[PDB]
Design a binder for this molecule. Structure first.
Ligand code: HEM
Ligand code: HEM
Ligand code: HEM
Ligand SMILES: [Cl-]
Ligand SMILES: [Cl-]
Lengths: 474, 474, 474, 474
């Protein structure tokens, strides 16, 4: 109840600075003034390079069907098994102050505090992505963000990049459909997007795809309304998630996976490891795993939502990486991003702490809250008591072939986009076309528009024709 | 024309990562992939704690009337004297991605590259401020920003704070008037707000107020339209400034000052050093100094607009600080903020470099681009050639009186706000009332609303009555 | 007992990196390799700008005589009152890897975890200092450290600076005496050096000087042996402190103060506020306060000794600052240094946490371990429950006189140094002279040596004569 | 000649702080005091995690024999071709203030500013290393540095680690020989240690080993003298290099390589890619390449020596990495270390700038000195003028075999160490034994000593016997 400094000393006057006489100059000995101002000056930290605008909530995951036959992952071992989790939803391009209701993919990050480590499933509200190789991420993101000279958004850059990257057609179609702007985070799906690996106790391998289906149903915002809400309420989605949980209308998602046995995978490498493609659900139907429920709002947004650190590379025994090139790059990127954005010791912050015990030889670093007791910080050592490797946790070995080199991917950039285009109801197709026209129509370089239109035409003649037609009407 | 790494080595493939066989894992030896991703991961820096959303432009200042009789400031010594300058305009509360057209004071920061050092005039588009003591800045800003728990804006906090800080009434009235949302940065005035000190060659002292009057005229956005534009174009003001300069419609401002001699100032301390008050232009009319013109857009936004560092404490001989408590705190705050946000050596970045020679004993620090030749980094020393103090630049001494202590200011919070309220034309008064009602009306704590309404009533009975009525009608 | 990653996931192989085939390239998907290497890469933090090489220990302070008649400081209110504390001893110029047994003042930093906040007494093993104005600290330290060009120590710089700063004579004499190199941290005294202020419950003011006298007695190392030990064992003092405590030979110090009533200061401002001078002990004898005992070694050196943050400005009710210009500058310097070296939230690290409750409106910042529950982060506010100022803690007001300006101190640089020179026994005087000769004798600029010798001659004719002669014999 | 602030404004008084009256408190408006102190507070940056204590110098490399037949490396294309370079020599374990003359490997880092990028050869004064897998580096270094609890060096940890890592025997033997402490940096050799790859214009591949032989000859310090010098002059090696260059006694090294054709290498993978082993000089004799000469001291130590960034991964066309596991980890480690220690934009500091043009899409980041002109920061793009990949620079592809997994290396840890032991003259062998005895003899755990002695015995019965015998005599 008494105001204090950061060292617990009481503050006598929090309204007036120490001054040399009523109208005299302010004194340097007003240490609290200095401290208060200095800490205020250091409140801002760098925002996430992408997915800066987000909302979070605590929850739980409950297994409905054991997956022990496919993975030794502890949190999925028994029916009814509960695991605490934390989720963060977000947009992609917008900065800290941007509006929620913009057209953009939505982040669907999940951190499961399992008994064998924190497992992160860092997905999106889309099963695919715009690119397939991590080396192109900075290029994609740069084209999606601000003009380095004017600081204004550049549709010219957005489309110039996509017109030279046909592999983005599938995701561009999803981005421009109605689902490009969800009604709320509670009304969108979640996907791991990448094909991941599951390994059971016997060492049997399976390639899987995660699908988090919203139990609230898919609902979107028409483009016009979304723009209106972007002005009337830029935190529309954040507020919605918070109010829903405070009103005890806990949103939930049913998680099911597509399971592809190793043997099967050997025939579909070009599809399975290309994140710009989906795996037919007729060939490999969804198998229910459990339910995710968000039931508790953060205590403090900055401490939990802003400081939380997710990484696709945060695996737990039983779940491993696949040769998906985009995923491969992400395995490095996130841990690296965390160290710059939060710090070498970000894992020590409450929201990032593991439920399972952490026993390392890792030491020091900035703001190290806990370095331990031990005099032994190296391994191998002659002290039986200290942490040792667990051979049991080695990843499953797989065969490597050919030469080390720079290989290109498949060129089947049109088939799946066309399939999606054909599945869209007439009313959504008109929106798809108008959304593209409104964006692509802002481009000045006629050569970029033509290249892009030829691309859409290759997906479906009507697709390209309709797009070209909508632009002419402006 | 050849893509290279940061060390100038050519890049062979910028589309595909090095992989162990066509469908094999990505290799750690792809150093460029690592570098490209790692540098991308470090692109974000902390945004300014306040005034994060801004736009900048290069320009010049030209003296129309020498001020040598009042100040020995070199850049104001001769008629026609030109000085290069850089300006940054901004809002206050919004983060990097926020919209331009929001109700908020606007920053009017100017950096003059004079022959005797970089002189910064860090003003606002208002002659006054909400508080008078720097110790309250973090409190004011916290109330103006996001709820620490929900991350949503809180009118409850905004008004709770103002209802307990009657000294804010004057500026709140300005904030809520039409000028609260300018049509563009080119259509608002600029002010130093604080009373500053001018000293001539003879050592004569004058207290002054800076007034930058827009030569394009004052123009504002009605609240409704502003909200609409906030959605349709969040970078409306940034784009406007850039287009105007690219179209050669160089915006300009006429600078004039109010000059109060030492002898006069002796009787007006309570008004002169209170930033919530203005000085009558009838008693002390504006005296023209020169013209500021913005005629060149930035080469790169991040390098120039984001990294530029301004400080009210960046004085040049002839211009000094006054005992204004708010100003006094700012003398510390900015340099401190720069060191955290940009770095100890931010002055070495092109946009922050002084035109005038920099000769110090300051050394090292992170990313030190230039440490010099000298073996002598201490003073006093026996080397005549090294930089020495210039007694000529000592500030003018002034008398100090009474006891060191925590003094409060005057309680005259209503008179000037009432004067302003009485000068507003009927149509703007209606807007003033509706703007307040829309905001204060969102508060839940009836005790806060009542306290605030009693405050407005004390400014003018009609003022408070109209506000109360407006709220009741919702 | 199982080795894990920072997220608690088990490590399968801590001896071999993931590789594409026995002799194939290392894979980027070995996330643990990446993490382990990356955290290792961030273990180093910037060392303290001064006093980088140190040792620490936990202990207690026990009051033997209540000081309630002179100060309302809670930790000194009752006889027998115990207060937990942490101490850090160090040299001044040496970097992290430098040897302990070098000639240099020794730091004597103490952090008392009192019930009204952490009180820091940041003193040295000397009652005085080399300079009297904080504006000269960077200059003094630069001259004391490495040549910016060669990175070698420079006696030319050391003496050039002292030869132009006669106020350093007193401390130079102490530095060059036998006490310039203590046998161990347990065999040196501690002093607050500066005159501080004590205020009792009635508001009565007293100026005080802190004296921590070693209960183990003063013992020093002859110059030759110290140099030998600097090679044979660079951590001689650190090891000594640790072994002594592990062997239960707890070192202790008896703290007593010199108490000067406010009114008495009227004739001593020139002495009392000039840190290059001491106050006569005959006029103002030592008054015992209590005993400090170090009885527990750190759990981890980096976490406690390296990360601890001390500040002379960390006062508690009853103890305040004096107008000593050097002290005044330190009031700013330390908190500022902490924010750069450790971080904005360094107060949250265990070693820096207050025992007394910390209730602020300060929020966020890098690595914020605790932001709290409250939605209210601004004051004044309408929530009675939130932290409020305690008028009772306001500092005692004192009168200010004259003009704001740049004033110079006293010119009596010789009297006290001469008194000390006359008190030294013949054998220590020979050492004093030889120590100076060995150092000053390395200077090349004959003008610097002459200026310095004239200075010593002014302290005492014999002093200067002996120094000049000792140098001649080289 | 006039002292100024960082913004070029003149300083009036650099000896006295602004004060409210002669004996009044210091004023916060003394912005220069604040700035001077604040910048001084930020002078320290984190030291290198290893090799913190070093010295540097500028020089040149002149080709004596063209290597065009083996590598297309531009700087080695013609006889007489000169390339500017910068070198940094250092120890390994010691911190910034440690002494030069300690037993430890010496760093031999070289940065060649070639016309096709900065090529870094980051070697040591030994052809081998203690470990063969990067995953063990943090463990090795931790054992070599300070006890986490006491902060004292721990021979118990040093030997515990080596006793469990027999692959270190070869390098330990070199470390303990006379060459463990060079007389000066000018009297030691330099090696790349790892086997690197050379590829010529026709695409032919060769595996190479770099050997920089000192033209001043090998000279060492006996252990006793080294310890003496460690106390008398901790910067003995730094001073030596500087004086030599200032006296125009430019030290030089003759570089020659061992060249192993791809076909030959196919049979020696276990030796070639194991850094604890050397390639026979009879089978593959040294082939002279050119001469390295150091002829210019740094302008400023901090700016050049402290801030320079080297990386084994900084290759230039014609030189590539080999599957050496230790090297592989280093390819990641250095760039990562630079980003933490110096910053994302360290490549922009003068000492790190490339001579060859740098054309990227990399942008922003902290302290970005140059972001350029371009509006185009993404690739692919439709602007012919912007930087594009150079397929010509792709690395040579090589075959990968088997399974992805955690493979262990060769177990031949004794043969080469024995060969070296047999080549040492009697007098050096006695030193080798005594050096080991003095160190290993300090270990308490008899089980560690026994394990280690059995290891030496396995190298050579006499080796182990002599070591065991030397210890017994203590
Ligand atoms: C080359 C490909 C990718 C790269 C290099 C990349 C990089 C990054 C980076 C640097 C961050 C910021 C992390 C932090 O600062 O904590 C991030 C966040 C995020 N990314 Fe990715 N990403 C890629 C692919 C993807 C994909 C395909 C998805 C989903 C399928 C995805 C979903 C997300 C999400 C949800 C976040 C926000 C996490 C949070 O809430 O903290 N990313 N990414
Ligand atoms: C106690 C009072 C105030 C405090 C403590 C304070 C503090 C700050 C801080 C810390 C910044 C960020 C600086 C940076 O990161 O470079 C800033 C920026 C700014 N402030 Fe203030 N401020 C106060 C009063 C005012 C007033 C009265 C005005 C104008 C009359 C003003 C105008 C501005 C402007 C224009 C900027 C943006 C400068 C830019 O474009 O970089 N401030 N302030
Ligand atoms: C796993 C093996 C190794 C790792 C992880 C490693 C890591 C590092 C790191 C992090 C640095 C500091 C870089 C900086 O802060 O700029 C460094 C510096 C250095 N290392 Fe290594 N290193 C390894 C092997 C080696 C080897 C085998 C040699 C020589 C054969 C070597 C020679 C050096 C040198 C000379 C420096 C100092 C460079 C300078 O002067 O700035 N290292 N190393
Ligand atoms: Cl980093
Ligand atoms: Cl800082």
């Amino acid at each position: 109840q008494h105001l204090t400094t950061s060292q617990g000393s009481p503050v006598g006057d929090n309204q007036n600075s120490l001054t040399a006489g009523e109208f005299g100059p302010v004194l340097i000995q007003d240490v609290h003034l200095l401290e208060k101002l200095a800490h205020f000056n250091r409140e801002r930290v760098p925002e996430r390079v992408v997915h800066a605008k987000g909302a979070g909530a605590h929850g739980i995951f409950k297994v409905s069907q054991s997956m022990a036959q496919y993975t030794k992952a502890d949190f999925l071992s028994e029916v009814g098994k509960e695991t605490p989790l934390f989720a963060r939803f977000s947009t992609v391009a917008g900065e800290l102050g941007s509006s929620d209701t913009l057209r953009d993919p939505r982040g669907f990050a999940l951190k499961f505090y399992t008994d064998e480590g924190n497992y992160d499933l860092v997905g999106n509200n889309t099963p695919i992505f715009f690119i397939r190789d991590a080396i192109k991420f900075p290029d994609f993101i740069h084209s999606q963000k601000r003009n380095p000279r004017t600081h204004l958004k550049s549709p010219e850059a957005v489309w110039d990049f996509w017109s030279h990257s046909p592999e983005s057609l599938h995701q561009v179609t999803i981005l421009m459909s109605d689902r490009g702007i969800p009604l709320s985070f509670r009304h969108m799906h979640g996907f791991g997007s990448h094909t991941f690996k599951w390994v059971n106790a016997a060492g049997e391998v399976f390639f899987v795809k995660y699908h988090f289906k919203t139990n609230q149903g898919i609902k979107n915002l028409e483009s016009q309304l979304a723009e209106e809400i972007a002005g009337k309420n830029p935190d529309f989605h954040i507020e919605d998630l918070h109010n829903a949980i405070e009103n005890q209308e806990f949103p939930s998602w049913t998680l099911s996976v597509q399971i592809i046995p190793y043997a099967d995978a050997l025939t579909m490498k070009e599809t399975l490891f290309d994140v710009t493609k989906t795996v037919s659900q007729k060939e490999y139907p969804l198998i229910e795993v459990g339910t995710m429920t968000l039931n508790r709002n953060p205590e403090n947004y900055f401490a939990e939502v802003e400081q939380v650190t997710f990484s696709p590379g945060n695996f737990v025994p039983g779940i491993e990486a696949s040769p998906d090139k985009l995923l491969q790059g992400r395995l490095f990127a996130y841990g690296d991003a965390h160290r710059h954005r939060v710090g070498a010791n970000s894992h020590q912050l409450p929201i990032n702490q593991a439920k399972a015990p952490v026993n390392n030889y890792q030491k020091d670093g900035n703001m190290r809250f806990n370095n331990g007791n031990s005099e032994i910080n190296y391994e191998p050592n002659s002290y039986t008591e200290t942490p040792k490797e667990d051979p049991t946790a080695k990843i499953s070995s797989f065969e490597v072939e050919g030469n080390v080199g720079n290989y290109s991917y498949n060129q089947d950039h049109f088939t799946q986009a066309n399939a999606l285009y054909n599945l869209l109801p007439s009313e959504e197709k008109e929106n798809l076309i108008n959304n593209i026209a409104a964006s692509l129509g802002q481009v000045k370089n006629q050569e970029i528009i033509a290249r892009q239109i030829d691309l859409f035409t290759r997906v479906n003649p009507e697709y390209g024709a309709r797009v070209a037609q909508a632009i002419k009407q402006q």
